[PDB]
Design a protein around this ligand. Structure first.
Ligand SMILES: *[C@@H]1O[C@H](CO)[C@@H](O[C@@H]2O[C@H](CO)[C@@H](O[C@@H]3O[C@H](CO[C@H]4O[C@H](CO[C@H]5O[C@H](CO)[C@@H](O)[C@H](O)[C@@H]5O)[C@@H](O)[C@H](O[C@H]5O[C@H](CO)[C@@H](O)[C@H](O)[C@@H]5O)[C@@H]4O)[C@@H](O)[C@H](O[C@H]4O[C@H](CO)[C@@H](O)[C@H](O)[C@@H]4O)[C@@H]3O)[C@H](O)[C@H]2NC(C)=O)[C@H](O)[C@H]1NC(C)=O
Ligand SMILES: *[C@@H]1O[C@H](CO)[C@@H](O[C@@H]2O[C@H](CO)[C@@H](O[C@@H]3O[C@H](CO[C@H]4O[C@H](CO)[C@@H](O)[C@H](O)[C@@H]4O)[C@@H](O)[C@H](O[C@H]4O[C@H](CO)[C@@H](O)[C@H](O)[C@@H]4O)[C@@H]3O)[C@H](O)[C@H]2NC(C)=O)[C@H](O)[C@H]1NC(C)=O
Ligand code: NAG
Ligand code: NAG
Lengths: 125, 125
Protein backbone atom coordinates (compact mmCIF):
# COMPACT_ATOMS: atom_id res chain seq x y z
CA UNK A 1 0.00 0.00 0.00
CA UNK A 2 1.52 3.31 1.19
CA UNK A 3 4.90 2.01 2.29
CA UNK A 4 6.86 -1.11 1.31
CA UNK A 5 6.41 -3.47 4.35
CA UNK A 6 3.41 -5.15 6.07
CA UNK A 7 2.05 -3.49 9.20
CA UNK A 8 4.31 -4.06 12.25
CA UNK A 9 7.36 -4.86 10.04
CA UNK A 10 10.38 -2.54 9.91
CA UNK A 11 11.95 -1.66 6.62
CA UNK A 12 15.73 -1.78 6.38
CA UNK A 13 17.23 -1.00 2.97
CA UNK A 14 15.65 -3.58 0.66
CA UNK A 15 14.09 -5.80 3.32
CA UNK A 16 11.20 -5.89 5.73
CA UNK A 17 12.06 -7.25 9.24
CA UNK A 18 9.90 -8.62 12.01
CA UNK A 19 11.35 -8.92 15.46
CA UNK A 20 9.44 -11.43 17.52
CA UNK A 21 7.94 -10.56 20.96
CA UNK A 22 7.88 -14.15 22.22
CA UNK A 23 10.56 -16.86 22.37
CA UNK A 24 11.21 -20.20 20.69
CA UNK A 25 13.87 -22.73 19.94
CA UNK A 26 15.45 -22.31 16.54
CA UNK A 27 13.32 -24.90 14.68
CA UNK A 28 10.07 -23.31 15.88
CA UNK A 29 11.41 -19.90 14.88
CA UNK A 30 11.98 -21.18 11.36
CA UNK A 31 8.43 -22.58 11.36
CA UNK A 32 7.08 -19.20 12.41
CA UNK A 33 8.90 -17.31 9.64
CA UNK A 34 7.70 -19.91 7.10
CA UNK A 35 4.13 -19.51 8.49
CA UNK A 36 4.49 -15.76 7.95
CA UNK A 37 5.68 -16.39 4.38
CA UNK A 38 9.12 -15.18 5.25
CA UNK A 39 12.71 -16.24 5.85
CA UNK A 40 14.72 -16.22 9.08
CA UNK A 41 17.06 -13.26 8.82
CA UNK A 42 19.96 -13.56 6.39
CA UNK A 43 22.95 -11.23 6.85
CA UNK A 44 25.19 -10.44 3.87
CA UNK A 45 28.01 -8.55 5.52
CA UNK A 46 29.17 -6.47 8.41
CA UNK A 47 27.35 -3.43 7.02
CA UNK A 48 24.03 -5.26 7.05
CA UNK A 49 24.73 -6.62 10.56
CA UNK A 50 25.46 -3.18 12.02
CA UNK A 51 22.39 -1.60 10.43
CA UNK A 52 20.17 -4.40 11.69
CA UNK A 53 21.66 -4.24 15.16
CA UNK A 54 21.02 -0.45 15.08
CA UNK A 55 17.26 -1.22 15.19
CA UNK A 56 17.58 -2.95 18.55
CA UNK A 57 17.25 -0.89 21.74
CA UNK A 58 17.79 -3.48 24.47
CA UNK A 59 21.45 -4.60 24.24
CA UNK A 60 20.91 -7.85 26.13
CA UNK A 61 18.21 -9.50 24.01
CA UNK A 62 19.16 -12.33 21.64
CA UNK A 63 17.47 -13.14 18.28
CA UNK A 64 17.75 -16.23 16.12
CA UNK A 65 18.81 -15.72 12.54
CA UNK A 66 18.72 -18.18 9.63
CA UNK A 67 22.07 -19.77 10.15
CA UNK A 68 22.91 -23.06 11.84
CA UNK A 69 25.61 -25.69 12.06
CA UNK A 70 25.40 -28.52 9.55
CA UNK A 71 27.25 -31.39 11.38
CA UNK A 72 27.71 -33.55 8.24
CA UNK A 73 29.25 -30.66 6.27
CA UNK A 74 31.12 -29.34 9.32
CA UNK A 75 30.25 -25.72 8.72
CA UNK A 76 27.64 -22.95 9.28
CA UNK A 77 24.91 -23.07 6.67
CA UNK A 78 22.28 -20.41 5.83
CA UNK A 79 18.75 -21.69 5.43
CA UNK A 80 18.90 -20.65 1.80
CA UNK A 81 21.40 -23.46 1.20
CA UNK A 82 24.64 -21.48 1.15
CA UNK A 83 27.55 -22.03 3.45
CA UNK A 84 28.81 -19.11 5.52
CA UNK A 85 31.43 -17.49 3.34
CA UNK A 86 33.46 -15.20 5.60
CA UNK A 87 34.26 -14.28 9.11
CA UNK A 88 32.33 -10.92 8.77
CA UNK A 89 29.88 -12.00 11.47
CA UNK A 90 32.57 -12.94 13.89
CA UNK A 91 30.57 -15.65 15.57
CA UNK A 92 31.32 -15.98 19.34
CA UNK A 93 31.19 -19.51 20.77
CA UNK A 94 31.45 -23.09 19.52
CA UNK A 95 30.90 -24.40 16.01
CA UNK A 96 29.35 -27.73 16.90
CA UNK A 97 26.42 -30.03 16.59
CA UNK A 98 23.01 -28.60 17.44
CA UNK A 99 24.28 -25.05 17.43
CA UNK A 100 22.42 -22.12 15.77
CA UNK A 101 23.34 -18.42 15.35
CA UNK A 102 21.78 -15.55 17.28
CA UNK A 103 22.49 -11.84 17.28
CA UNK A 104 22.22 -9.09 19.84
CA UNK A 105 22.67 -5.42 19.36
CA UNK A 106 26.42 -5.85 20.06
CA UNK A 107 27.38 -9.42 19.10
CA UNK A 108 26.85 -12.65 17.14
CA UNK A 109 26.66 -15.88 19.14
CA UNK A 110 26.62 -19.61 18.68
CA UNK A 111 23.89 -20.88 20.94
CA UNK A 112 22.35 -24.31 21.40
CA UNK A 113 19.38 -24.69 19.02
CA UNK A 114 17.05 -25.64 21.84
CA UNK A 115 17.62 -22.32 23.62
CA UNK A 116 14.42 -20.30 23.75
CA UNK A 117 14.98 -16.76 22.45
CA UNK A 118 13.35 -14.27 20.08
CA UNK A 119 13.89 -14.41 16.31
CA UNK A 120 13.89 -12.13 13.28
CA UNK A 121 11.99 -12.83 10.06
CA UNK A 122 12.54 -11.05 6.75
CA UNK A 123 10.79 -10.43 3.45
CA UNK A 124 12.74 -9.05 0.49
CA UNK A 125 11.52 -5.96 -1.39
CA UNK B 1 0.85 -8.99 -12.21
CA UNK B 2 -1.42 -10.38 -14.99
CA UNK B 3 -2.13 -13.51 -12.94
CA UNK B 4 -2.20 -14.11 -9.20
CA UNK B 5 0.80 -16.39 -8.74
CA UNK B 6 4.52 -15.94 -9.41
CA UNK B 7 5.99 -17.63 -12.48
CA UNK B 8 6.46 -21.41 -11.89
CA UNK B 9 3.83 -21.44 -9.17
CA UNK B 10 0.40 -23.04 -9.74
CA UNK B 11 -2.69 -21.37 -8.42
CA UNK B 12 -5.15 -23.60 -6.58
CA UNK B 13 -8.21 -21.71 -5.32
CA UNK B 14 -6.88 -19.18 -2.87
CA UNK B 15 -3.26 -20.37 -2.78
CA UNK B 16 -0.21 -20.36 -4.96
CA UNK B 17 1.62 -23.72 -4.86
CA UNK B 18 5.15 -24.73 -5.79
CA UNK B 19 5.95 -28.43 -6.32
CA UNK B 20 9.68 -28.97 -6.00
CA UNK B 21 11.68 -30.78 -8.74
CA UNK B 22 14.51 -31.83 -6.38
CA UNK B 23 14.40 -33.84 -3.12
CA UNK B 24 15.24 -33.12 0.47
CA UNK B 25 14.63 -34.37 3.98
CA UNK B 26 11.78 -32.58 5.73
CA UNK B 27 13.80 -29.97 7.61
CA UNK B 28 15.54 -28.80 4.47
CA UNK B 29 12.18 -28.63 2.69
CA UNK B 30 10.92 -26.28 5.44
CA UNK B 31 14.08 -24.20 5.01
CA UNK B 32 13.43 -24.02 1.25
CA UNK B 33 9.86 -22.82 1.66
CA UNK B 34 11.02 -20.25 4.17
CA UNK B 35 13.73 -19.10 1.74
CA UNK B 36 11.01 -18.76 -0.90
CA UNK B 37 8.98 -16.64 1.60
CA UNK B 38 6.37 -19.37 1.83
CA UNK B 39 4.98 -22.12 4.04
CA UNK B 40 5.17 -25.87 3.54
CA UNK B 41 1.74 -26.93 2.36
CA UNK B 42 -1.11 -26.78 4.83
CA UNK B 43 -4.28 -28.85 4.11
CA UNK B 44 -7.62 -27.78 5.63
CA UNK B 45 -9.80 -30.75 4.71
CA UNK B 46 -10.50 -33.59 2.36
CA UNK B 47 -11.63 -31.24 -0.39
CA UNK B 48 -8.34 -29.33 -0.35
CA UNK B 49 -6.44 -32.59 -0.32
CA UNK B 50 -8.24 -33.96 -3.32
CA UNK B 51 -7.90 -30.71 -5.29
CA UNK B 52 -4.16 -30.58 -4.56
CA UNK B 53 -3.64 -34.29 -5.46
CA UNK B 54 -5.44 -33.58 -8.74
CA UNK B 55 -2.39 -31.47 -9.67
CA UNK B 56 -0.05 -34.41 -9.40
CA UNK B 57 0.64 -36.43 -12.64
CA UNK B 58 3.01 -39.15 -11.56
CA UNK B 59 1.23 -41.58 -9.16
CA UNK B 60 4.64 -42.71 -7.74
CA UNK B 61 5.98 -39.44 -6.30
CA UNK B 62 5.69 -38.23 -2.71
CA UNK B 63 5.68 -34.58 -1.49
CA UNK B 64 6.39 -33.33 2.02
CA UNK B 65 3.76 -31.12 3.57
CA UNK B 66 3.91 -28.88 6.69
CA UNK B 67 2.88 -31.52 9.19
CA UNK B 68 5.07 -33.63 11.44
CA UNK B 69 5.02 -35.63 14.62
CA UNK B 70 5.55 -33.62 17.71
CA UNK B 71 6.90 -36.08 20.31
CA UNK B 72 5.79 -34.25 23.48
CA UNK B 73 2.10 -34.39 22.57
CA UNK B 74 2.39 -37.56 20.49
CA UNK B 75 0.31 -35.67 17.92
CA UNK B 76 0.66 -34.56 14.33
CA UNK B 77 1.32 -30.79 14.42
CA UNK B 78 1.13 -28.26 11.50
CA UNK B 79 4.00 -25.80 11.17
CA UNK B 80 1.61 -22.97 11.87
CA UNK B 81 1.34 -24.15 15.52
CA UNK B 82 -1.99 -25.97 15.32
CA UNK B 83 -2.38 -29.68 15.94
CA UNK B 84 -4.03 -31.94 13.40
CA UNK B 85 -7.76 -31.56 13.73
CA UNK B 86 -9.59 -34.20 11.73
CA UNK B 87 -9.17 -37.65 10.22
CA UNK B 88 -9.85 -36.21 6.71
CA UNK B 89 -6.19 -36.95 5.74
CA UNK B 90 -6.43 -40.69 6.54
CA UNK B 91 -2.73 -40.87 7.31
CA UNK B 92 -1.13 -44.21 6.44
CA UNK B 93 1.68 -45.62 8.51
CA UNK B 94 2.73 -45.05 12.03
CA UNK B 95 2.57 -41.98 14.20
CA UNK B 96 5.91 -42.12 15.91
CA UNK B 97 9.05 -40.15 16.71
CA UNK B 98 10.81 -38.50 13.75
CA UNK B 99 7.96 -38.97 11.35
CA UNK B 100 6.69 -36.30 8.93
CA UNK B 101 3.77 -36.31 6.53
CA UNK B 102 3.93 -36.64 2.72
CA UNK B 103 1.22 -36.84 0.07
CA UNK B 104 0.96 -38.72 -3.20
CA UNK B 105 -1.74 -38.42 -5.88
CA UNK B 106 -3.73 -41.10 -4.03
CA UNK B 107 -2.67 -41.18 -0.36
CA UNK B 108 -1.16 -39.50 2.72
CA UNK B 109 1.80 -41.24 4.39
CA UNK B 110 3.87 -40.97 7.54
CA UNK B 111 7.51 -41.17 6.50
CA UNK B 112 10.77 -40.82 8.39
CA UNK B 113 11.71 -37.10 8.34
CA UNK B 114 15.18 -37.93 6.94
CA UNK B 115 13.71 -39.46 3.83
CA UNK B 116 14.59 -37.49 0.69
CA UNK B 117 11.49 -36.63 -1.29
CA UNK B 118 9.94 -33.64 -3.08
CA UNK B 119 7.93 -30.95 -1.18
CA UNK B 120 5.18 -28.42 -1.71
CA UNK B 121 5.32 -24.75 -0.73
CA UNK B 122 2.35 -22.42 -0.53
CA UNK B 123 1.59 -18.66 -0.52
CA UNK B 124 -1.90 -17.48 0.48
CA UNK B 125 -3.79 -15.17 -1.77
C1 LIG C 1 22.12 -16.91 1.46
O1 LIG C 1 22.17 -15.75 2.25
C2 LIG C 1 23.49 -15.30 2.49
C3 LIG C 1 23.45 -14.10 3.42
O2 LIG C 1 22.74 -13.01 2.84
C4 LIG C 1 24.16 -14.97 1.12
O3 LIG C 1 25.50 -14.87 1.53
C5 LIG C 1 26.17 -13.70 1.05
O4 LIG C 1 26.28 -13.91 -0.36
C6 LIG C 1 26.90 -12.80 -1.05
C7 LIG C 1 26.76 -13.09 -2.53
O5 LIG C 1 27.43 -14.34 -2.88
C8 LIG C 1 28.34 -12.66 -0.54
O6 LIG C 1 28.84 -11.50 -1.20
C9 LIG C 1 29.85 -11.80 -2.19
O7 LIG C 1 31.10 -11.69 -1.54
C10 LIG C 1 32.22 -12.00 -2.36
C11 LIG C 1 33.46 -11.95 -1.49
O8 LIG C 1 33.56 -10.55 -1.14
C12 LIG C 1 34.66 -10.31 -0.26
O9 LIG C 1 35.91 -10.55 -0.92
C13 LIG C 1 36.09 -9.80 -2.13
C14 LIG C 1 37.44 -10.18 -2.73
O10 LIG C 1 38.46 -9.84 -1.77
C15 LIG C 1 39.78 -10.36 -2.06
O11 LIG C 1 40.19 -9.99 -3.37
C16 LIG C 1 40.32 -8.58 -3.63
C17 LIG C 1 40.94 -8.40 -5.01
O12 LIG C 1 39.93 -8.68 -5.96
C18 LIG C 1 41.16 -7.86 -2.58
O13 LIG C 1 40.92 -6.45 -2.70
C19 LIG C 1 40.80 -8.28 -1.16
O14 LIG C 1 41.72 -7.64 -0.28
C20 LIG C 1 40.76 -9.82 -1.03
O15 LIG C 1 42.05 -10.40 -1.23
C21 LIG C 1 36.06 -8.30 -1.83
O16 LIG C 1 36.12 -7.52 -3.04
C22 LIG C 1 34.78 -7.96 -1.09
O17 LIG C 1 34.96 -6.60 -0.74
C23 LIG C 1 33.88 -5.74 -1.15
O18 LIG C 1 32.71 -6.00 -0.36
C24 LIG C 1 32.89 -5.74 1.06
C25 LIG C 1 31.62 -6.20 1.82
O19 LIG C 1 31.96 -6.77 3.10
C26 LIG C 1 33.23 -4.26 1.29
O20 LIG C 1 34.41 -4.11 2.09
C27 LIG C 1 33.44 -3.54 -0.03
O21 LIG C 1 32.16 -3.45 -0.68
C28 LIG C 1 34.37 -4.30 -0.96
O22 LIG C 1 34.43 -3.64 -2.23
C29 LIG C 1 34.58 -8.84 0.13
O23 LIG C 1 35.59 -8.62 1.12
C30 LIG C 1 32.25 -10.98 -3.49
O24 LIG C 1 33.30 -11.32 -4.43
C31 LIG C 1 30.95 -11.00 -4.23
O25 LIG C 1 30.99 -9.91 -5.17
C32 LIG C 1 30.46 -10.30 -6.44
O26 LIG C 1 29.07 -10.47 -6.48
C33 LIG C 1 28.30 -9.31 -6.10
C34 LIG C 1 26.80 -9.65 -6.11
O27 LIG C 1 26.57 -11.05 -5.78
C35 LIG C 1 28.65 -8.12 -6.99
O28 LIG C 1 28.10 -6.98 -6.32
C36 LIG C 1 30.15 -7.91 -7.15
O29 LIG C 1 30.43 -7.03 -8.24
C37 LIG C 1 30.86 -9.22 -7.46
O30 LIG C 1 30.54 -9.65 -8.78
C38 LIG C 1 29.74 -10.82 -3.31
O31 LIG C 1 29.75 -9.49 -2.76
C39 LIG C 1 28.33 -12.45 0.94
O32 LIG C 1 29.61 -12.49 1.53
C40 LIG C 1 27.54 -13.60 1.65
N1 LIG C 1 27.62 -13.36 3.07
C41 LIG C 1 27.72 -14.27 4.04
C42 LIG C 1 27.83 -13.73 5.42
O33 LIG C 1 27.70 -15.51 3.84
C43 LIG C 1 24.05 -16.13 0.14
O34 LIG C 1 24.51 -15.78 -1.15
C44 LIG C 1 22.61 -16.56 0.04
N2 LIG C 1 22.46 -17.64 -0.92
C45 LIG C 1 21.57 -17.64 -1.90
C46 LIG C 1 21.59 -18.86 -2.79
O35 LIG C 1 20.75 -16.72 -2.05
C1 LIG D 1 -2.98 -24.42 10.52
O1 LIG D 1 -3.23 -25.01 9.27
C2 LIG D 1 -4.25 -26.02 9.36
C3 LIG D 1 -4.43 -26.65 7.98
O2 LIG D 1 -4.85 -25.65 7.07
C4 LIG D 1 -5.58 -25.47 9.95
O3 LIG D 1 -6.22 -26.67 10.35
C5 LIG D 1 -7.62 -26.65 10.08
O4 LIG D 1 -8.21 -25.81 11.05
C6 LIG D 1 -9.64 -25.70 10.79
C7 LIG D 1 -10.17 -24.47 11.52
O5 LIG D 1 -9.81 -24.58 12.89
C8 LIG D 1 -10.28 -27.02 11.17
O6 LIG D 1 -11.69 -26.93 10.91
C9 LIG D 1 -12.40 -27.52 12.04
O7 LIG D 1 -12.51 -28.93 11.84
C10 LIG D 1 -13.24 -29.55 12.94
C11 LIG D 1 -13.26 -31.06 12.75
O8 LIG D 1 -14.11 -31.26 11.61
C12 LIG D 1 -14.03 -32.52 10.93
O9 LIG D 1 -14.42 -33.63 11.75
C13 LIG D 1 -15.81 -33.72 12.12
C14 LIG D 1 -16.02 -35.10 12.74
O10 LIG D 1 -17.29 -35.25 13.39
C15 LIG D 1 -16.78 -33.47 10.93
O11 LIG D 1 -18.07 -33.17 11.47
C16 LIG D 1 -16.38 -32.29 10.03
O12 LIG D 1 -17.20 -32.22 8.83
C17 LIG D 1 -14.90 -32.40 9.67
O13 LIG D 1 -14.75 -33.54 8.82
C18 LIG D 1 -14.67 -28.98 12.95
O14 LIG D 1 -15.47 -29.65 13.95
C19 LIG D 1 -14.65 -27.47 13.18
O15 LIG D 1 -16.02 -27.01 13.12
C20 LIG D 1 -16.31 -25.59 13.05
O16 LIG D 1 -17.67 -25.39 12.64
C21 LIG D 1 -18.62 -26.17 13.41
C22 LIG D 1 -19.98 -26.06 12.72
O17 LIG D 1 -20.03 -24.84 11.97
C23 LIG D 1 -18.61 -25.73 14.89
O18 LIG D 1 -18.50 -26.84 15.81
C24 LIG D 1 -17.49 -24.72 15.19
O19 LIG D 1 -18.06 -23.42 14.95
C25 LIG D 1 -16.17 -24.86 14.37
O20 LIG D 1 -15.68 -23.53 14.05
C26 LIG D 1 -13.73 -26.82 12.14
O21 LIG D 1 -14.30 -26.87 10.83
C27 LIG D 1 -9.71 -28.09 10.25
O22 LIG D 1 -10.17 -29.38 10.67
C28 LIG D 1 -8.15 -28.05 10.31
N1 LIG D 1 -7.69 -29.07 9.40
C29 LIG D 1 -6.76 -29.97 9.68
C30 LIG D 1 -6.52 -31.00 8.63
O23 LIG D 1 -6.14 -29.96 10.78
C31 LIG D 1 -5.37 -24.60 11.16
O24 LIG D 1 -6.55 -23.85 11.46
C32 LIG D 1 -4.21 -23.66 10.94
N2 LIG D 1 -3.93 -22.86 12.13
C33 LIG D 1 -3.73 -21.54 12.17
C34 LIG D 1 -3.41 -20.99 13.53
O25 LIG D 1 -3.77 -20.81 11.17
C1 NAG E 1 18.55 -30.86 8.39
O1 NAG E 1 19.07 -31.97 9.11
C2 NAG E 1 20.32 -32.46 8.56
C3 NAG E 1 20.77 -33.66 9.39
O2 NAG E 1 20.12 -33.64 10.68
C4 NAG E 1 21.39 -31.35 8.51
O3 NAG E 1 22.63 -31.77 7.90
C5 NAG E 1 20.83 -30.17 7.72
O4 NAG E 1 21.79 -29.11 7.62
C6 NAG E 1 19.54 -29.68 8.39
N1 NAG E 1 19.00 -28.48 7.71
C7 NAG E 1 18.65 -27.33 8.31
C8 NAG E 1 18.16 -26.28 7.35
O5 NAG E 1 18.71 -27.12 9.53
C1 NAG F 1 10.99 -28.33 17.09
O1 NAG F 1 11.65 -29.32 17.85
C2 NAG F 1 10.90 -29.60 19.05
C3 NAG F 1 11.76 -30.53 19.91
O2 NAG F 1 12.28 -31.57 19.08
C4 NAG F 1 9.52 -30.17 18.66
O3 NAG F 1 8.71 -30.30 19.84
C5 NAG F 1 8.78 -29.21 17.72
O4 NAG F 1 7.49 -29.72 17.32
C6 NAG F 1 9.70 -28.93 16.54
N1 NAG F 1 9.06 -28.03 15.56
C7 NAG F 1 8.78 -28.38 14.31
C8 NAG F 1 8.14 -27.29 13.51
O5 NAG F 1 9.04 -29.46 13.81
Amino acid sequence: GLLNCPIYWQQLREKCLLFSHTVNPWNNSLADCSTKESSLLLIRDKDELIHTQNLIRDKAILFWIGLNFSLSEKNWKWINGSFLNSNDLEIRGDAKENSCISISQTSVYSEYCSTEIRWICQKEL
